[PDB]
Amino acid sequence: GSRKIIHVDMDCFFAAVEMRDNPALRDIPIAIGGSRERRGVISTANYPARKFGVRSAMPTGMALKLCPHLTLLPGRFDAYKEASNHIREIFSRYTSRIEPLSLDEAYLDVTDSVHCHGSATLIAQEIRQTIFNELQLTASAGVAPVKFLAKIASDMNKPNGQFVITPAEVPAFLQTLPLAKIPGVGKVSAAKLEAMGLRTCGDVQKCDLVMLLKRFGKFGRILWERSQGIDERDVNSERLRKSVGVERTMAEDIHHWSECEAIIERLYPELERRLAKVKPDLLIARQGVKLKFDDFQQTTQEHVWPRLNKADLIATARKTWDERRGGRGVRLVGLHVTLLDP
DNA sequence: TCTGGGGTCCTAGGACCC
DNA sequence: CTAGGGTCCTAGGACCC
Ligand SMILES: Nc1ccn([C@H]2C[C@H](O)[C@@H](COP(=O)(O)NP(=O)(O)OP(=O)(O)O)O2)c(=O)n1
Ligand SMILES: [Mg+2]
Ligand SMILES: [Mg+2]
């Protein structure tokens, strides 16, 4: 039969949090990101800032050119994590089939429920209302027979709204639905599709799957599927974090290896703590290092390793710095571990 | 404007053992 | 009648939040 998926997405998450915890903001253009001297980027802006065209992933200086009297906050992640924990707890009250995607997003599966007589509409409605009650903070939601359509639905009545797609409304919805709205279809893909001539799902509904498979491979057949309205993916409930990293971007490029080693030594204790929380004994399936150069090119050097240790990371780093650097300076130094299957 | 810090999933391409 | 060609790694892209 038809499944019942709800996707929930907080509104302007970080900015919403700083707004609630300080309404002295609330009406000024603010953004969470790094400082311009520290070569930072906008993590998120509120609507008064977006008004000036300030977006997430935008370099901070650019956001400042668009909004000089922007109020930039560094971030308070433990609070965001508190809110995430909270809304997840709320999600549980209605179902066990919950797949978190981030601090502020999740998929919920509710096709087997008595909570609103089967009304995904009313359960979503509730969830949002109690998020506003308990957390004093808004939320938007989408409802659909499949994941990606619930994702797309949760945007369509944003902010503090919800939207519901029924199996009856799907082909109508799909005929004029732009490809760039489907998750996983970013600007590169959305360009290749333009050259190919594809803009709506309805355009893909009438092409040749052999072609998409030849020019896109996987996440090419997916497009054909989603355009036909198929997404047989399921809420995972026990999806676990496969990797953990810690990386730092410096205010000035470094050109001395001593600087690099020093930075690795400042970063490792932080890779320690975070690892000592999924595996307090220090797992490792693989470990590795990351260098970003002045020309904004990066390289990662990882390998199979038994257990987390600094010496191997510094060896690998001294080697990555002597073999891939090419006289360049480095803006970013990073540490990284992959984790085991169980 | 001069571009973060976390992560996900795919793929090419090399290297090694058979 | 000095394997080649298949596996399994690593590096990197694209995308997500
Ligand atoms: N590039 C990005 C995008 C998201 N994030 C963080 C900041 C956001 O508050 C949070 C939520 O992701 P998001 O839903 O895409 N953005 P946000 O909730 O602020 O906007 P809306 O969902 O209301 O449109 O992730 C980030 O740090 N870097
Ligand atoms: Mg989001
Ligand atoms: Mg959001």
Side-chain angles (χ1 to χ4, degrees), chain A residues 1-3 5-64 66-205 207-342:
Chain A
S2 155
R3 230 143 90 247
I5 292 84
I6 140 95
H7 174 267
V8 190
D9 192 318
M10 299 296 103
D11 300 313
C12 284
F13 194 54
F14 295 177
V17 170
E18 311 294 335
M19 268 168 151
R20 181 192 71 189
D21 295 11
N22 184 266
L25 284 355
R26 185 49 103 171
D27 262 342
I28 38 188
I30 79 180
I32 291 83
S35 159
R36 179 180 186 161
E37 285 68 34
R38 290 82 210 179
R39 299 153 111 192
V41 165
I42 297 307
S43 213
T44 195
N46 61 16
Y47 298 92
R50 305 186 181 185
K51 209 213 309 158
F52 295 78
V54 173
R55 300 291 180 267
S56 285
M58 174 179 290
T60 293
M62 183 183 172
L64 283 176
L66 303 178
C67 187
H69 296 66
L70 178 72
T71 299
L72 235 139
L73 297 79
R76 307 177 309 117
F77 302 93
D78 296 335
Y80 310 155
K81 176 57 171 175
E82 113 210 320
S84 186
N85 296 334
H86 201 130
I87 75 163
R88 282 191 175 100
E89 181 276 324
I90 296 181
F91 292 151
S92 50
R93 306 176 182 170
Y94 294 81
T95 188
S96 187
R97 301 286 304 280
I98 306 161
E99 181 168 8
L101 307 161
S102 47
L103 294 188
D104 93 309
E105 294 187 8
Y107 281 115
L108 298 91
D109 195 320
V110 299
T111 135
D112 318 341
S113 292
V114 286
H115 224 299
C116 294
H117 220 284
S119 183
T121 305
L122 238 308
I123 300 166
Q125 185 73 73
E126 283 196 346
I127 284 180
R128 309 206 295 100
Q129 179 54 239
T130 149
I131 289 168
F132 194 44
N133 294 334
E134 313 196 16
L135 291 102
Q136 191 196 343
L137 223 51
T138 89
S140 300
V143 178
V146 290
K147 268 178 178 170
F148 89 97
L149 283 187
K151 176 62 191 182
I152 293 176
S154 62
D155 273 318
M156 255 178 300
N157 264 353
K158 223 163 201 304
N160 203 325
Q162 92 190 27
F163 186 75
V164 177
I165 312 170
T166 70
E169 297 153 329
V170 164
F173 189 86
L174 255 42
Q175 253 306 329
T176 60
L177 176 72
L179 300 185
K181 263 169 173 184
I182 296 191
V185 189
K187 54 180 188 172
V188 177
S189 326
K192 285 191 91 289
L193 267 13
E194 207 69 21
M196 214 80 43
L198 289 337
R199 194 180 57 81
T200 61
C201 287
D203 295 343
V204 180
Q205 282 178 24
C207 56
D208 158 85
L209 186 45
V210 186
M211 186 82 59
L212 300 74
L213 278 158
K214 185 50 183 288
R215 325 219 78 262
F216 313 81
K218 201 187 187 176
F219 239 142
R221 146 226 326 281
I222 286 199
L223 217 107
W224 192 81
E225 291 177 356
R226 312 282 176 272
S227 294
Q228 294 288 359
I230 109 99
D231 183 20
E232 220 76 1
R233 290 184 297 148
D234 34 38
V235 182
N236 203 284
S237 315
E238 316 143 304
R239 145 192 283 273
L240 43 255
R241 188 143 132 266
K242 312 195 182 186
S243 56
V244 34
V246 179
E247 57 191 35
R248 192 59 52 216
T249 288
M250 285 71 62
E252 201 229 303
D253 313 311
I254 63 167
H255 296 82
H256 300 183
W257 152 255
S258 74
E259 300 170 301
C260 181
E261 187 194 329
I263 290 165
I264 253 216
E265 281 199 275
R266 297 306 187 181
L267 293 204
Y268 181 85
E270 194 59 25
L271 184 52
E272 197 83 319
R273 304 190 315 100
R274 310 228 311 240
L275 187 58
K277 251 133 231 186
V278 191
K279 204 93 193 328
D281 35 323
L282 296 349
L283 197 42
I284 303 250
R286 305 194 317 268
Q287 69 173 9
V289 290
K290 189 181 180 178
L291 290 186
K292 199 128 169 155
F293 308 104
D294 55 52
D295 60 314
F296 219 72
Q297 183 179 261
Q298 61 184 46
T299 187
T300 54
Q301 184 163 356
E302 286 186 70
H303 60 249
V304 165
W305 194 250
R307 181 224 200 266
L308 180 76
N309 74 286
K310 199 166 60 182
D312 183 73
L313 291 168
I314 302 192
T316 323
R318 183 177 272 114
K319 141 157 51 186
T320 337
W321 170 282
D322 287 334
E323 298 188 13
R324 307 179 193 193
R325 201 168 132 262
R328 290 173 295 183
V330 15
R331 56 184 293 112
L332 169 144
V333 188
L335 292 179
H336 182 269
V337 336
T338 309
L339 300 175
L340 286 204
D341 302 344

